[PDB]
Amino acid sequence: KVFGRCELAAAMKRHGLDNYRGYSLGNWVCAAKFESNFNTQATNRDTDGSTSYGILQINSRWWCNDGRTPGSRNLCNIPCSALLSSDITASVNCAKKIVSDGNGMNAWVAWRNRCKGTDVQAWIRGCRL
Ligand SMILES: [Cl-]
Ligand SMILES: [Cl-]
Ligand SMILES: [Cl-]
Ligand SMILES: [Cl-]
Ligand SMILES: [Cl-]
């Protein structure tokens, strides 16, 4: 599924991401824009051999199981393929664990490089939320 911007904002808000660990909704929408372009089916291989999955590009080294990332963990207790669903529940639940891990949203490199410190409220502009 390719989410609309406001469509994703509403779903993220419903699932309790707005101000989760202090991060406003616009931070989460911005992260998803640059991680996946709002496409739930996005997958991208990383140089370490892991793969990142879904709307928030949750990675197989620590967070989900894909059976092909040696030495990895599955801390969200989920198959990585379950993060590609049109229903973002699994991705949100896993993102809550990631953002609680110690480094906040810096865990998403695209968030640090492209959203952090910017006018992230722009990402929810015009949305009836
Ligand atoms: Cl957009
Ligand atoms: Cl915001
Ligand atoms: Cl594995
Ligand atoms: Cl699995
Ligand atoms: Cl933080």
Structural domain spans, the chain: 1-129
Task: Give the pair of three-digit tokens for residue 114.
Answer: 């492209």
Question: In angstroms, what is the resolution?
Answer: 1.5
Nearest ligand atom owner, CA of 27: 2
Strand pairing category for 58-59 and 51-53: antiparallel
The domain 1-129 having CATH identifier 1.10.150.80: the answer here is no
Going by C-alpha positions, the residue among 28, 42, 38, 49 that lies closest to residue 107 is 28
Residues with CB under 5 A from ligand 5 (ion): 104
Nearest ligand atom owner, CA of 71: 3
Going by C-alpha positions, the residue among 83, 12, 93, 89 that lies closest to residue 54 is 83
Method: X-ray
Task: Give the pair of three-digit tokens for residue 116.
Answer: 């952090």
Distance CA 129, CA 79 (A): 31
Contacts of 51 (CB under 8 A, 6+ apart): 43, 44, 45, 59, 60, 66, 68, 69, 80
Residues with CB under 5 A from ligand 4 (ion): 65, 79
